[PDB]
Design a protein around this ligand. Structure first.
Ligand SMILES: [Zn+2]
Length: 140
């Protein structure tokens, strides 16, 4: 589990979005596993605006933050998980590291702020849904 709180936006994995998120929907994309909902309260998270490929992510299943190198956001084939079939996922960054389904929502951060959230796992890789291209999260 986990979310990004930027301005009046809540960013979550689409597969973990609640009824309240859908009832306050701003934007969603299945291919990216992202959904954004509107919030009453101001969030303080800063979204990274950068092309960093090193950062730190939170792994709930190990109660640890791990420094990682990660690929640039790409269209990648993802094997079946407990929450998605085998399919292509877009805007996905991969690192070597641990990721269980419950780790989805863990933040990946670089010196510039929040890069993305854990979205995929398996075969000793962790995949992150990038948010750094969603420049509109910074405004409205
Ligand atoms: Zn950065």
């Amino acid at each position: 589990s986990g979310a990004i709180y930027v301005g009046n936006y809540r960013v979550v994995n689409r597969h973990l979005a609640t009824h309240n998120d859908w009832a306050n929907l701003v934007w969603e994309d299945s291919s990216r596993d992202l959904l954004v909902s509107s919030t009453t309260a101001q969030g303080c998270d800063t979204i990274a605006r950068c092309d960093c490929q090193t950062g730190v992510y939170y792994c709930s299943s190990r109660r640890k933050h791990y420094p990682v190198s990660f690929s640039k956001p790409s269209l990648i084939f993802v094997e079946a998980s407990e929450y998605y079939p085998a399919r292509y996922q877009s805007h996905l960054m991969l690192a070597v590291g641990h990721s269980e389904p419950g780790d989805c929502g863990g933040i990946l951060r670089c010196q510039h702020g929040v890069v993305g959230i854990v979205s995929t796992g398996g075969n000793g890789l962790v995949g992150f849904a990038d948010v750094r291209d969603l420049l509109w999260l910074d405004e409205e």
